[PDB]
Design a protein around this ligand. Structure first.
Ligand SMILES: Nc1ncnc2c1ncn2[C@@H]1O[C@H](COP(=O)(O)OP(=O)(O)OP(=O)(O)O)[C@@H](O)[C@H]1O
Lengths: 224, 337, 231, 113
């Protein structure tokens, strides 16, 4: 049966409604689809869209195109590609899984910049030093600081304070296991790194991060 | 400027969704019908589950239409929050289109602002899963092509505004032979969710954007050129950041000095090769020097900085030029210490 | 931890897809062979039309392998976008693998990140319509069982991104007794698309995920728990 | 194996490519209609410019269909080469379907051919 054939379909449950999905595609084409009424849940991967070109295309920035575009479904997201010469137009992908800010919270979580301590405080990693606070949590500051290390389509989404608050709320709902701190006894944590003591070298950046030092001397290190 | 355009009180409706284009020109009773507002009301009462979709009869006959829009919100909120949001949203949209009217329509700015801010109609979808409602100003008239040409500026405002309503305005309805569902009817024969009236307006005539009736307190304007004459904007877009700030950010990553810093303007920065001298190791690839200069390119709202010739040799850096407006205010308040 | 655990210089390859298990067990010279790095180069040169399928010789005896991935995007991609796409692909993949290596594997999070983004081996297909390759991480060693448990989070990562390269991740390869097509050979004798090498790596030793050679910069981590408690 | 598995002679035909989902379930006469073979022949002659698309009415109930193929060659071919090409085309498609039927379907290899 299909269970032994493939655990795949064209429209599995959990995906958004088809009419909503097409609405998202119609947003990317700033122009209007002419043969829009030829699409349903059974032929949208075969019927080519005859776009009209009053304004330049939002995908290739050209004035007009020789051939109609065509959709394709893959891995839970419908792809847009142009028939004819493939190199004339770029590739655009419309997701269908869920929301975007939860993905932002996930990405902020993988980089291991937020941790949970025994006392209940949330330590962050900003300016090459672990910081924490009780009356005012620092999660939003870390979000705004780490904005840069994310792809373009995620960076601009991270400026509205309400959306940063939503991302922080999502982050606080994933930390369930506590982590101990200050287990290395022969290190001197500074404001811009930790100075190793066994051999005198001074780490910084990513290297000076596994030593989870909470308290710091408060001033920067000047190797000169 | 004859009486034909001074009066249009013939409503044209559609029955089913996705009406075939092979029958509209034939005007089959089974798909289309003409009506008067009074005749429209009784037909709605006689068929409780009927689905109706207002459409414009013929584009070349009467292209004048009211200023209408739709907003789709994907969550629920308090009622006071609607009241404060809709008022700001009405104010913000009034400013933008009035500027467009003063820019590409040759209309009086204050006259346009006064005309719409006086009177307007509001609907509301009873669907509490996702809220979405129509807004129709009554005392503003324009042709279909005007809304089509202004499709771009509405999109720009929605991206870089504050109110949730204006953040989710739908500009896709502005098209050829657009369809607006009449208030109080189902979308499909299975969904009972319909648009309900709102106080104080109750007459059906004040809920259709095809019922045109020029009285003595309304304003009308239109495009001067033809639709197939629009020239796109320059390489820049006047909505994110002034040119000098963006160039300085590009200058800050390059540790070395840019010799040709003065020939870059708001139009030539996408073609002038950035010939640089590497007194210090390159800030990107940490190399001594390179065979070819770098280059700039605007795409999606950033400046993809790369080196031409053999691109795989040097890494690619992207400068995020933000389009937010209050964030610039915060930055300016901060950098003054 | 003996000498043989810090080295594996024997290659086990197939020659045809869908080899039956009994023919695999009997180690007949008609379907399966053993090889060395230098010998394998000679075999490919002598058979410019052959077809090989790299796989693990024995599962329970030896499980430590390099980290490998697969991508198959059915659209051409311009060079500048290709470079931009691959930068994000390494960034997002490195974070996701390291995060799991810290929360259920008991390894140092920052140690894994440094070891992967430093040195990675990239191929490229010869087809001009689609873009596919086999990205192999060199200095990150783990058991086959860990990668099998890694499948669930990788599928979530691929499905919840925008970058086309990371959205076309082939997550079905991770199974028991896996097969990866070696570089320079065809898929079937009728196929005309093969995989070629990329700079700066030239020796073939840099493209087999079964080759275990842990140097000073290598890192290792494995699941503490077993695959039976994980209901 | 019953008559439901031994008989299907009702033709369900659409009237426009891309029928909305909200109406196919309700079987609106304006979009879809079910016909018999004789009434199909009358309807097409009645309407000079109709647009029809035969489909399957109920997938999970009656999934039994014949074998069909489509060829779209955008190049003129002479009849003599057309005659020799179609025969070898039937030769090639015959072996491909027969091989899989003997492989994953258990069908008689000679019988399917
Ligand atoms: N790109 C398009 N081209 C043509 N018609 C379109 C396009 N996008 C949407 N439509 C039409 O507009 C209709 C809008 O229906 P939708 O599901 O959005 O209803 P709604 O949210 O209740 O609000 P409203 O009907 O007022 O937009 C669609 O059913 C479709 O008929």
């Amino acid at each position: 049966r299909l269970e032994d054939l493939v655990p795949d379909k064209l429209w599995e449950p959990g995906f958004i409604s088809f009419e909503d999905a097409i609405k998202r595609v119609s947003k990317i084409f700033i122009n209007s689809i002419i043969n829009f009424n030829d699409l349903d849940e059974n032929n949208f991967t075969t019927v080519p869209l005859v776009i009209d070109y009053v304004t330049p295309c939002a995908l290739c920035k050209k004035r007009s195109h020789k051939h109609p575009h065509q959709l394709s479904l893959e891995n839970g997201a419908i792809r847009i590609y142009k028939t004819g010469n493939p190199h004339s137009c770029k590739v655009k992908i419309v997701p269908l899984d869920g929301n975007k800010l939860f993905n932002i919270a996930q990405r902020i979580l993988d980089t291991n910049s937020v941790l949970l301590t025994e006392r209940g405080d949330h330590i962050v990693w900003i300016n090459n030093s672990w910081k924490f606070n009780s009356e005012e949590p620092l999660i939003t500051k870390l979000i705004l600081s780490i904005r840069h290390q994310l792809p373009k389509e995620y960076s601009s989404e991270l400026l509205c304070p309400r959306k940063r608050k939503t991302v922080e709320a999502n982050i606080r709902d994933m930390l369930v296991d506590s982590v101990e701190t200050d287990t290395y006894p022969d290190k001197l944590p500074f404001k811009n790194g930790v100075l190793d003591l066994v051999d005198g070298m001074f780490y910084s950046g990513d290297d000076a991060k596994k030593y989870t030092c909470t308290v710091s001397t408060g001033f920067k290190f000047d190797d000169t | 400027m004859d009486a034909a355009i001074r009066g249009n009180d013939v409503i044209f409706v559609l029955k089913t969704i996705g009406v075939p284009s092979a029958c509209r020109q034939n005007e089959d009773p089974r798909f289309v019908e003409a009506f008067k507002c009074d005749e429209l009301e009784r037909y709605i009462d006689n068929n409780p589950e009927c689905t109706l979709f207002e459409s414009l009869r013929d584009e070349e006959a009467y292209s004048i239409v009211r200023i209408f829009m739709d907003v789709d919100l994907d969550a629920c909120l308090d009622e006071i929050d609607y009241l404060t949001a809709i008022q700001d949203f009405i104010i913000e949209v009034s400013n933008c289109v009035a500027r467009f009217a003063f820019t590409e329509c040759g209309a009086i700015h204050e006259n346009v602002i006064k005309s719409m801010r006086s009177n307007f109609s509001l609907t509301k979808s009873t669907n509490r899963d996702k809220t979405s409602f129509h807004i129709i100003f009554l005392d503003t008239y324009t042709t279909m092509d005007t809304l089509i040409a202004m499709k771009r500026t509405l999109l720009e405002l929605s991206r870089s505004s504050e109110n949730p309503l204006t953040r989710s305005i739908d500009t896709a309805v502005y098209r050829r032979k657009t369809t607006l569902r009449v208030v109080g009817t189902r979308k499909n024969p299975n969904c009972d969710t319909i648009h309900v009236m709102q106080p104080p307006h109750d007459n059906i005539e004040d809920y259709l954007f095809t019922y045109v009736d020029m009285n003595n307190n309304s304003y009308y304007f239109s495009l001067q050129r033809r639709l197939e004459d629009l020239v796109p904007d320059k390489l820049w877009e006047p909505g994110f950041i002034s040119f000098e700030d963006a160039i300085k950010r590009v200058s800050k990553i390059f540790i070395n000095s840019i010799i040709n810093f003065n020939d870059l303007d708001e139009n030539n920065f996408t073609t002038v090769p950035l010939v640089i001298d590497y007194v210090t190791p390159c800030a990107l690839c940490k190399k001594r020097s390179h065979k070819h200069p770098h280059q700039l390119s605007l795409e999606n709202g950033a400046i993809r900085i790369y080196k031409t010739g053999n691109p795989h040799s040097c890494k690619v850096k992207i400068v995020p030029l933000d389009g937010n407006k209050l964030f610039n205010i915060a930055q300016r308040i901060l950098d003054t210490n």
